[PDB]
């Protein structure tokens, strides 16, 4: 018993982290293969940050200005090329380490794992959501850039997310592994609104399961409710709609506690109407929506 | 910006993590150099589990009857010795991924870093505090016994906690790597009183301060307070008293932010008396007490 933000096992990601250098922007890099995946804004000074041309400034870089280290010996730059709003590197030698990887566009509301680095060096390992509005609240200080976002499946590291900037309002952008940034967002240090986000009512339901699983039963109510009825209260508190699929996707936990998805969902329209009352689900003293269903079985079931 | 609860890289400890069984009974051990360490509760049988003679179950076990995989080769058993409440299997092969490592007795409110193994495989890493009553509140299934908490410093794993058992109050118990339990705990099935916890003050002021690192500062009053003064609001909310040397160890953060102690010490006692009144620090609605002054600094600061 017992639930936590768990994170996946980093070590096959630590073992791809590598530093690249282009002038004097240093961050880091994914080797994977015999190729370095970077955030293209390493070949930018803080000038041309506020408005650059990335065509025009990859021009003025050769293989040899770009400086890729991992760990303390060096890689030969044979290639490289834009693809979107990231570098790949080609490099002389495959990485040793390679793990059995795949290069996947996660969906908002989906969760990974951020192995944060600086210098090519991991620091820390913390579990998030992609939020509904396609950033991430994460934790990355300057010289960050190029960490990555991964899920694990066995063997196979699927890596969903590279690092890019943090906005005015200190939550973070980013791109999947073909450079193509999650939300509206442009590598330009300019202002961009967010957008609105909402709550990933789906993954709340999954950790009330996780919570019944684990003995916190308090919050169970009397009650049932429709799809139409709750949806009229999610919109009043900033929740995502809950469709059928999403029912669908809780049918393994309505499954193993009993609790049928619109009786679990009656308990949470009164907890948002009425609040927590001082009281606490998990340790938390609000609704966490970073757990998926599948997080929520896998945690709970014990998958390696 | 941002702060998150955040573990170490898994890497190094992956690595080491191994599947010991004996007889019937599965777990994971931790193989470091040429010795596996594991519970010795792996020699028992659920029949024997609720008063059992250690001494008397090792003596019907040989080398032979210790089966230690690392995954997929069987290492040979040379040796077998109880220290205290955990098993050294002497092997015949010294790990190829040992990393630089020490054992050590970690003091109740410090963190650490989890991996979660079953079968000798990992399955997930999450931080958390050796509680003052010196349980942990962790995420662990049957068979996750011998699964290891460590820190990490640049190159050296300190690995401080193996785990052994769940409580009937669904909290977490085990001991250092020389078999000695945090606590008051006994590897036997018997109810157990795990005492009553506090919560961690300079963990929580800590947090006060990387909250306000990271811009969230409605908490923040026109009030100073004492030691003493703060001390009798700890009492009665069962928080542990805040000595010198808590004040001391927040000196870094206290000069970072300057803001002092006992000026933080009177947001906290405001926060205690009056609630959050609906509002958040740092994503949370409660007191984060799973956080040192260290943990602080790292991650504010990016140390890899
Ligand atoms: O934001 C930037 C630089 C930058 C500016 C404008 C656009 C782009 Cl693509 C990149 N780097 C960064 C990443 N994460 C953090 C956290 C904190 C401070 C800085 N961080
Ligand atoms: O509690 C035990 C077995 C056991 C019983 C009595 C004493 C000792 Cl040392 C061990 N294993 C275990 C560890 N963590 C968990 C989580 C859930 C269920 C079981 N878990």
Redesign the pocket.
């Known amino acids: 018993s017992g639930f936590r933000k768990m994170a996946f096992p980093s070590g096959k990601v630590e073992g791809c982290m590598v530093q690249v250098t282009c002038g004097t922007t240093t961050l880091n890099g994914l080797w994977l293969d015999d190729v370095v995946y970077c955030?293209r804004?390493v070949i930018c000074t803080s000038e041309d940050?506020l408005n650059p041309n990335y065509e025009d400034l990859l021009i003025r870089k050769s293989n040899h200005n770009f400086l890729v280290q991992a760990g303390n010996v060096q890689l030969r730059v044979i290639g490289h090329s834009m693809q979107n709003c990231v570098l790949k590197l080609k490099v002389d030698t495959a990485n040793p380490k390679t793990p059995k990887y795949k290069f996947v566009r996660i969906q908002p509301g989906q969760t990974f794992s951020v192995l944060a680095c600086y210098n090519g060096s991991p620091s820390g390992v913390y579990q998030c959501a992609m939020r509904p509005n396609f950033t991430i609240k994460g934790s990355?200080?300057?010289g960050?850039?190029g960490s990555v976002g991964f899920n694990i499946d066995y063997d196979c590291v699927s890596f969903c997310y590279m690092?890019?900037?943090?906005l005015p309002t200190g939550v973070?952008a980013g791109t999947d592994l073909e450079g193509n940034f999650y939300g509206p967002f442009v590598?330009?240090?300019t202002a961009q609104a967010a957008g609105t986000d909402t709550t990933i009512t789906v993954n709340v339901l999954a950790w009330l399961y996780a919570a019944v699983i684990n003995g916190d039963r308090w919050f169970l109510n009397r009650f049932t409710t429709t799809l139409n009825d709750f949806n009229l209260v999610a919109m009043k508190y900033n929740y995502e709609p809950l469709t059928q699929d999403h029912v669908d996707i809780l049918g393994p936990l309505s499954a193993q506690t009993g609790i049928a998805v619109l009786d679990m969902c009656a308990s949470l329209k009164e907890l948002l109407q009425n609040g927590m009352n001082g009281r606490t689900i998990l340790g938390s003293a609000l609704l966490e929506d970073e757990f998926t269903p599948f997080d929520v079985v896998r945690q709970c079931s014990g998958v390696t």
Chains 1, 2 share one sequence.
């Open positions: 955030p804004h940050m990355f200080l300057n960050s850039c690092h890019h900037m943090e973070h590598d330009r240090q």
